[PDB]
Amino acid sequence: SLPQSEGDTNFGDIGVQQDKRRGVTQMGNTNYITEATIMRPAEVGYSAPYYSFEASTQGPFKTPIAAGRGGAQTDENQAADGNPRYAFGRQHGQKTTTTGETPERFTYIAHQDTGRYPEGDWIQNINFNLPVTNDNVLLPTDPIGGKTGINYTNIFNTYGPLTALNNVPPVYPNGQIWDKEFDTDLKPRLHVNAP
Amino acid sequence: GVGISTGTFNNQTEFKFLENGWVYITANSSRLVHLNMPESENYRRVVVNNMDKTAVNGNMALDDIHAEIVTPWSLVDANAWGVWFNPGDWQLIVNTMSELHLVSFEQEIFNVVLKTVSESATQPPTKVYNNDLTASLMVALDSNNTMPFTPAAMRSETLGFYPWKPTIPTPWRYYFQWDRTLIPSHTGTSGTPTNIYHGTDPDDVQFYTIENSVPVHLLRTGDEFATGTFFFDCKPCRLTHTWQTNRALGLPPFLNSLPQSEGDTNFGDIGVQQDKRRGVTQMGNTNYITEATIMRPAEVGYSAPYYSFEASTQGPFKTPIAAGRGGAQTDENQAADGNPRYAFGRQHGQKTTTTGETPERFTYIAHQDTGRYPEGDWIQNINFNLPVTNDNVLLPTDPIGGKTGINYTNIFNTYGPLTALNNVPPVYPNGQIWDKEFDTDLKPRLHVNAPFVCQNNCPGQLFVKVAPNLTNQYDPDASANMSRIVTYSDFWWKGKLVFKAKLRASHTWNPIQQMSINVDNQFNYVPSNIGGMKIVYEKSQLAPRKLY
Amino acid sequence: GVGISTGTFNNQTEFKFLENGWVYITANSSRLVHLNMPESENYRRVVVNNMDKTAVNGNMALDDIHAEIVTPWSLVDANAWGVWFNPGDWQLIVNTMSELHLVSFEQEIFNVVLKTVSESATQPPTKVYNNDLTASLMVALDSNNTMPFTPAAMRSETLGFYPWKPTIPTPWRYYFQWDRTLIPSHTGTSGTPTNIYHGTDPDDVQFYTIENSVPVHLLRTGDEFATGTFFFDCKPCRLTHTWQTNRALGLPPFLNSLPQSEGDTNFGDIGVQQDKRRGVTQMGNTNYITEATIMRPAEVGYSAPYYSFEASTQGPFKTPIAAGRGGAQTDENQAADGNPRYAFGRQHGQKTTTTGETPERFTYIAHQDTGRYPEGDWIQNINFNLPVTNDNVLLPTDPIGGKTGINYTNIFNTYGPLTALNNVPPVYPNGQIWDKEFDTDLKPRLHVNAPFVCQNNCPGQLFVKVAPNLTNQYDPDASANMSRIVTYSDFWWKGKLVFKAKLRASHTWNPIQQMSINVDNQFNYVPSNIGGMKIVYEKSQLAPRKLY
Amino acid sequence: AKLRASHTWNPIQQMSINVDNQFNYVPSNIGGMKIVYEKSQLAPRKLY
Amino acid sequence: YYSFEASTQGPFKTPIAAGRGGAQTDENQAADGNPRYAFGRQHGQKTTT
Amino acid sequence: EFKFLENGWVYITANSSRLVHLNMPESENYRRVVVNNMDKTAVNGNMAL
Numbered sequence A: 001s002l003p004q005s006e007g008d009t010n011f012g013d014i015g016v017q018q019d020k021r022r023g024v025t026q027m028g029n030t031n032y033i034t035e036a037t038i039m040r041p042a043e044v045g046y047s048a049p050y051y052s053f054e055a056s057t058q059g060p061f062k063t064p065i066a067a068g069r070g071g072a073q074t075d076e077n078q079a080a081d082g083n084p085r086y087a088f089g090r091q092h093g094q095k096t097t098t099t100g101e102t103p104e105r106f107t108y109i110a111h112q113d114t115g116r117y118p119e120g121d122w123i124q125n126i127n128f129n130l131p132v133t134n135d136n137v138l139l140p141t142d143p144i145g146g147k148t149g150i151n152y153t154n155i156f157n158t159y160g161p162l163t164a165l166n167n168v169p170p171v172y173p174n175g176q177i178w179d180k181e182f183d184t185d186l187k188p189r190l191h192v193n194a195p
Numbered sequence B, C: 001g002v003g004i005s006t007g008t009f010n011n012q013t014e015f016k017f018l019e020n021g022w023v024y025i026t027a028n029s030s031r032l033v034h035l036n037m038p039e040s041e042n043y044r045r046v047v048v049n050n051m052d053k054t055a056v057n058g059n060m061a062l063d064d065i066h067a068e069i070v071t072p073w074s075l076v077d078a079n080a081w082g083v084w085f086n087p088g089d090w091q092l093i094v095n096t097m098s099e100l101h102l103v104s105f106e107q108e109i110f111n112v113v114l115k116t117v118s119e120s121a122t123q124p125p126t127k128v129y130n131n132d133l134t135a136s137l138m139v140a141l142d143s144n145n146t147m148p149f150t151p152a153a154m155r156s157e158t159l160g161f162y163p164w165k166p167t168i169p170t171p172w173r174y175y176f177q178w179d180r181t182l183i184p185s186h187t188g189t190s191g192t193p194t195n196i197y198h199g200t201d202p203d204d205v206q207f208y209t210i211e212n213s214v215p216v217h218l219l220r221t222g223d224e225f226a227t228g229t230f231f232f233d234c235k236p237c238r239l240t241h242t243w244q245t246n247r248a249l250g251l252p253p254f255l256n257s258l259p260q261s262e263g264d265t266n267f268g269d270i271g272v273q274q275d276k277r278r279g280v281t282q283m284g285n286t287n288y289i290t291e292a293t294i295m296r297p298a299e300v301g302y303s304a305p306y307y308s309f310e311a312s313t314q315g316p317f318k319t320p321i322a323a324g325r326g327g328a329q330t331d332e333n334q335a336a337d338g339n340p341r342y343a344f345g346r347q348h349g350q351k352t353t354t355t356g357e358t359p360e361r362f363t364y365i366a367h368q369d370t371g372r373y374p375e376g377d378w379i380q381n382i383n384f385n386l387p388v389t390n391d392n393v394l395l396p397t398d399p400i401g402g403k404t405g406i407n408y409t410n411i412f413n414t415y416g417p418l419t420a421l422n423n424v425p426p427v428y429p430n431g432q433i434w435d436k437e438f439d440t441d442l443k444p445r446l447h448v449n450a451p452f453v454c455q456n457n458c459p460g461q462l463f464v465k466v467a468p469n470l471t472n473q474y475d476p477d478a479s480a481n482m483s484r485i486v487t488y489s490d491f492w493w494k495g496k497l498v499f500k501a502k503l504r505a506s507h508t509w510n511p512i513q514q515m516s517i518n519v520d521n522q523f524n525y526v527p528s529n530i531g532g533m534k535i536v537y538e539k540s541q542l543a544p545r546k547l548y
Numbered sequence D: 001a002k003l004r005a006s007h008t009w010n011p012i013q014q015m016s017i018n019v020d021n022q023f024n025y026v027p028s029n030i031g032g033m034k035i036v037y038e039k040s041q042l043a044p045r046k047l048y
Numbered sequence E: 001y002y003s004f005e006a007s008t009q010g011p012f013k014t015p016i017a018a019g020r021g022g023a024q025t026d027e028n029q030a031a032d033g034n035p036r037y038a039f040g041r042q043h044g045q046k047t048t049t
Numbered sequence F: 001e002f003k004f005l006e007n008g009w010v011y012i013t014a015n016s017s018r019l020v021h022l023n024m025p026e027s028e029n030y031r032r033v034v035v036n037n038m039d040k041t042a043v044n045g046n047m048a049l
Ligand SMILES: [Ca+2]
Pocket: A111, A112, A113, B201, B203, B204
């Protein structure tokens, strides 16, 4: 069913009951073929725990994120995607005739959409059965560990054998250009500081 | 050239046995395709918005909104196993070969025909079909792959599966960028969540046209189009399955006590206190060497969150799983392993003499044991100390987030540097055969939709369309869409797909599993008294192989 | 040959990067053209006389009378930017290249088709279109340019601008000598001025016929017509703009006093009495060296009379202006600079789904500053003596001839041996590309309608027409026009236009202007949900360059 | 590096000076400079 | 850590590939998965035991 | 400098030169120094600092 009147408010329509469609799905116990349900080759981007500090022999440190920008800019969650922030001054970009020791800074937001919008996630019981019942859904709104400010998305990780992502983009003019590689037996697939 | 054929119909499968147990398999397939003129000659930018469904709290998963560009072209897709092999060939391959290689592909179009419909509006009124020997069929072959890749198998819109039944192509259309936000909720949820379609981001707009990017060929009745041969560059696909799980790797414990009476109820016995055994373990604070505790080289398979939907710039989507079948079939958890389900009909497997729009379907369960049985998992405090106390165990029975229906296994992930898994197995006949690879800097280790992923370039798509057949009165300056003579085309399609396989040999004293006809399935491979056919799905990797 | 194609549809734009930053741009464009038989098979000598409009004193400018010869032939014209490039290509050229060269051109006609209309006058009554495999399309290519040059872009009757929308040619007709007199007047004017059409002068009569001066080709369905390649001989066109006016040429005055506080409101100061400075001036009777007084090498741009109509043998006509845009856009005086205005529709840019006969239009404003701002001019007595006294200044505010609405700037002209100006810039997509040169002894230094003027010969025009399809009864001796079978033709047109351009490099610390899509224009480059298209005009010379 | 070519009917995103940013690429009357950050990957490409 | 997963033939421990992050006195050998070796007489244990 | 070669391949050469100013070291020896801002982290909830 196609639109007969100009205007992006005049929508088209698939025109076939969701449970009577044809196609492939990775949900063996239902007949619903939805745009959120139908099968896709693999997965673009991944979910990582945010504002996570891990510890080892010399103290705590933040857990790095390699992510694009999945989410309409106005909305985002720069923590979830790990956007870099740069502080500098006088000799590297800040207005030359400025005074005082307060640096200049900016948070770089990439164009590539390989990020995530946590508030959009959710997990549900395999019986499916919609509309889902409160007891069969874990929302980025339900508390974890009793804490009112902690999600599951907060410690969630969806990296796996089907994960596809892109390298980091150049950042003019404060970005580093090249970088030495770690001398470990197994190397990282990328670095977050230089392309 | 109106009066002579330009081709030969061929639907034979040839097996060429070479030296060293290597087989050359040539799959010829040809079909009669029927094509109607486009409803419109323009490209349309259309948005779908079923907010009525998702406006009901707890229906997030039924989200269908997206934007697409509707083109006046049709896609001729033959990427599905059923197009090339019949159940007879599949049995020969699956029971005999041990691995399969995808070599080359090529298609051709011949004996084109264009008729015109004359509406003898009178008496009944009648219709008349006449040949239009000057009309043209338009053919475009996107060899550089400029256009977006849209594999019809995904929506079961591939070429039919019967050499003697005419078929058709599918209208071509592709995705167009849009920005969408949908906040999750459940039945109890109060108020209205947030369900917004923001629109389109300028930096992501890509409007593609076949006219501007591909050379179009005009074929008349005496014309014919051929493609050269295309050689694939993919990894071989194995037709064998592994059965060992972490529990069956290595040297079993020596039994100091053996059974003296036949009967699988008369057990043997290791005969050594669990805390006085020798061997290696990765649990530094205990002396228990158990079959669940002893060390294994690495890990077969992994745990992933199930019925997990993640969100990004254009709405939510399910988190894919690449898993075998760990768990006695009767028990399983197809959600946990992500078994695929296929819905299709009449032209691709569903009983031909059926009626109604309800499709046919099945959930494919693999033979390889690389899956998980969640209800079997559990986590415990490092002090160990058995029997474990309720406060030192997290069971797939204890609730998370207060929710009574959510586990930890539900959001659990055990993928890491020690993870070993296998690729996806073929799925006859509804499966897709090959797939293009993502153009990202870091690629996936596999795809869940097809066994063969083109490392180089995949074969470009073939688009076909009926050129406009105008009447005496046409006016370029006319908002209201013009008039054309009703025209349609019929042409024969022919393709050749070549694989290369390797013959198997016996290695165990016992027989192996094999596909076979029998009293029960017998009638799923023959026509009915009315001529009704159907193509039941089969499995590809019967036949074990060691893992370690 | 009725059953096979004679061509390939191609509408790809190819960019071939050669050594030294030189690009080879090949523009392929092809279209489906629809053609109807002529209303008449004879040449008509027709006169147009709208004396009813000009009979009203003060309407001189609405004069439409002329004489033309109406021919039974049609003109296939493709001389307009929109025919060859889409907005995507134009952005690449305009943002990257620094100059453009016109190299060669060639066309072809293939897959000709001739149908016949059968009037099934009954019931509805119905119509029937049948192929007439023996009918012929007539093709004439005026290679020696015997015929008058009539560029269809002038009246927006060029080939359409969309690869997927069928198009049409325009009926051909040309001017025929006539003598006309029209005396100017205004509303107050008493009596009737003098509005006469004297007729035709014998020494200027030129009746042209295609049959007598060009070889005509007869094409049937299996036929095809091709042109050789034609190589242009024109000057290169620059894709850059100058911004310096006489006021920004040379060494600025040294400032003895500089600003000590940031802010463009904190000015610097030359610091030297205006009558005690050093430098050169062209005002022998004063010692004032001002920025408006100091000498400059020559003069950029010139002043011309505006809304000036001159008259000769066949009536009045506007006086052309070749000028840039001198004057902050908000202020301007588009009359003074002669900005062009373009009206067109549906087939050449106006929204495709629009209705009604009102065209779409725009006034092109160039980037180059070679224009004038009249209100800024003034003339003064040589004694100088400031502040100038009212009796020694003529302002664009003092009336001339007693008229309160007429200036001196209005009839002013400052063109001379020191005048420097630039050629006209491309205008996408409605602009004409090339133009034939006047065959006078002394040529113009430029044309205001196209950037490329053929110095040698331009490519001759291509005329097409449906040969007469007679019925059983035809009588040569019949005043009343005979009878023909209703016949029409449809054929594919294909052309290739090759340019040669040069890639730009950065030279200033700051970024330059560039064409870009954005939230606001985004939807002017994509189809609507109904399939409506439109092609918005763009500018060609963004990117400055020094003048001196 | 490798030069790009057009492939879609519509224009693509491009960096450009304008009334608003104009003065971030020029000195002040006092000679003050600054270097504002820019983005590098404007211009889409298909993923699949 | 101290995670047992299950499949077709019963539960099994989830392996860890890790060094020793943490001042030895403190550690969490479970978290890093340090291996433990038990043997005797013929492979290291005091021969006269 | 931008050098356009055949096949749309560009050779970009970036020359950069600067005047560098250098003062003598405060000390001619190597020092092994420890930084300890326990005053900040001694406040519960400031781990990240
Ligand atoms: Ca984006």
